[PDB]
């Protein structure tokens, strides 16, 4: 599933995303754009042999299963497939247990470099919520 951006940002907010750990819910969206192009299908390999899966590509190496990164850990205690339904329940859920890790919303790359200190409510314009 392709996400509208509002439709996103409603989602996320219904499943209690928003001010997560802090992290408003234009963080979120502005994550999810980046990592995913709010596609719920988007994989990406890494170089380790990981993979990212889905809206909030959400890494094998640590969170999900995959059955094929060997030595890794699945700390949300899910099938990495699962992280790729139209549902985003898992993703957020799983999203939920990265965040409050340590390094807070760091964790996801594309936020770090392209929304974190920039003006994330914008993401959200035009919303009702
Ligand atoms: C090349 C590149 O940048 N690729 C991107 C991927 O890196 C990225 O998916 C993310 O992958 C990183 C690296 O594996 C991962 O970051 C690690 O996360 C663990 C778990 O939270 C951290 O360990 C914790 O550290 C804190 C701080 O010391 C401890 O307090 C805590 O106890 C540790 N937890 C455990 C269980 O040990 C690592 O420190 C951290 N490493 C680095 C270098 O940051 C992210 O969690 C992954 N992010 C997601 C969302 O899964 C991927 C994301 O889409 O994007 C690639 O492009
Ligand atoms: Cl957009
Ligand atoms: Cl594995
Ligand atoms: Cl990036
Ligand atoms: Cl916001
Ligand atoms: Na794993």
Redesign the pocket.
């Known amino acids: 599933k392709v996400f509208g951006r509002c439709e996103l940002a409603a989602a996320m907010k219904r499943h209690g995303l928003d001010n997560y750990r802090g992290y408003s819910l234009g963080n979120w969206v502005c994550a999810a754009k980046f ?1 995913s192009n709010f596609n719920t299908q988007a994989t ?1 390999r ?3 042999g ?1 993979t ?1 899966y889905g809206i ?4 094998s ?3 999900c299963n995959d059955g094929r990164t060997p030595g890794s ?1 699945n ?1 949300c205690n899910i099938p990495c497939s699962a992280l790729l339904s139209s549902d985003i329940t898992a993703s957020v859920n799983c ?1 939920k247990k ?1 965040v409050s ?3 807070g919303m ?5 936020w770090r470099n392209r929304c974190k200190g920039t003006d994330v409510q914008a993401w959200i314009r035009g919303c009702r919520l």
């Open positions: 990592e990406n890494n170089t380790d990981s990212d909030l590509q959400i890494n190496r640590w969170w850990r700390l999203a990265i890790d340590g390094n760091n964790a996801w790359v594309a």
